Amino acid sequence: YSTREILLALCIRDSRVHGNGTLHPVLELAARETPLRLSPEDTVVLRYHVLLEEIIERNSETFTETWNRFITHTEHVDLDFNSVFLEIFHRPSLGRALAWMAWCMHACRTLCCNQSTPYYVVDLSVRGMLEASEGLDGWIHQQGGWSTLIEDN
Amino acid sequence: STMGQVGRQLAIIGDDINRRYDS
């Protein structure tokens, strides 16, 4: 599984836990376009979902404020996702990787539960986070993959 | 640079997570 696949599966899974029973069309589309091969009910996804939820709960206010300033100040959502990714990943710690994945999953949850959010905002955000996250593939590969990182290590 | 600041705030949290996992 690539980072983009695991992130998208975590977002899908999180929507099933928090939402109204309808997957956002944007998540359906990214599943179609990615070829998502990983099930959101796969045990590695449930385990990461626990870890990312703990990080969110522990950073709940800072996640809300950072998301709120990002989203209210961007004129090009998908480009700016790639900019914050660079700011964090410069050089690559496990904590930093998870902070970014939890922040993305938290942003997706916020976008998808607000029925007033315009489609294009949800769309460009989910595309931006998925594309930016690909920058983690080289590093996670040198750790033997996401499954190995969680089952293990 | 709101993108700068969001980045740095997330980086701080990344560092906190590492120490957290060490205990």
Author numbering:
A (entry chain A): 3 to 93, 96 to 157
B (entry chain B): 69 to 91
Task: Please give the exact wording used by the authors of the publication that reports this structure.
Some viruses, such as Epstein-Barr virus (EBV), encode homologs of the mammalian pro-survival protein Bcl-2. In this study, we have confirmed that EBV BHRF1 exerts its pro-survival function by directly inhibiting a sub-set of pro-apoptotic Bcl-2 family proteins Bid, Bim, Puma and Bak, presumably ones most critical for the virus. We have therefore determined crystal structures of BHRF1 in complex with its key targets, the BH3 domains of Bim and Bak. Our three-dimensional structures show that these interactions closely resemble those seen with mammalian pro-survival proteins such as Bcl-xL.
Recombinant BHRF1 bound a 26-mer Bak BH3 peptide (KD = 150 nM), but only weakly (>1 µM) to Bax BH3. Consistent with the binding data, we observed that BHRF1 could directly counter Bak, but not Bax, when these proteins were expressed in yeast. Taken together with the previous reports that BHRF1 interacts with the full-length Bak, but not with Bax, we conclude that BHRF1 can keep Bak inactive by direct binding, but must inhibit Bax indirectly, presumably by its ability to sequester BH3-only proteins such as Bim. Bak BH3 binds in an equivalent manner, and the two complexes superimpose with an RMSD of only 0.6 Å over the entire BHRF1 backbone indicating their similarities. These changes affect mainly α4, which is at a 120° angle to α3 in the BH3-bound form, compared to the near anti-parallel alignment in the free form. The side-chain interactions contributing to the BHRF1-BH3 complexes are equivalent to those observed for mammalian pro-survival proteins such as Bcl-xL, with the four conserved hydrophobic BH3 residues of Bim (I58, L62, I65 and F69; numbering based on human BimL) protruding into pockets within the BHRF1 hydrophobic binding groove. Similarly, Bak residues V74, L78, I81 and I85 (numbering based on human Bak) interact with the BHRF1 binding groove. In addition to the hydrophobic interactions, BHRF1 R100 forms a salt bridge with Bim D67 or with Bak D83. The conservation of aspartic acid in the mammalian BH3 ligands suggests that this interaction is of particular importance for complex formation, and indeed a BHRF1 R100A mutation reduces Bim binding and abolishes interaction with Bak.
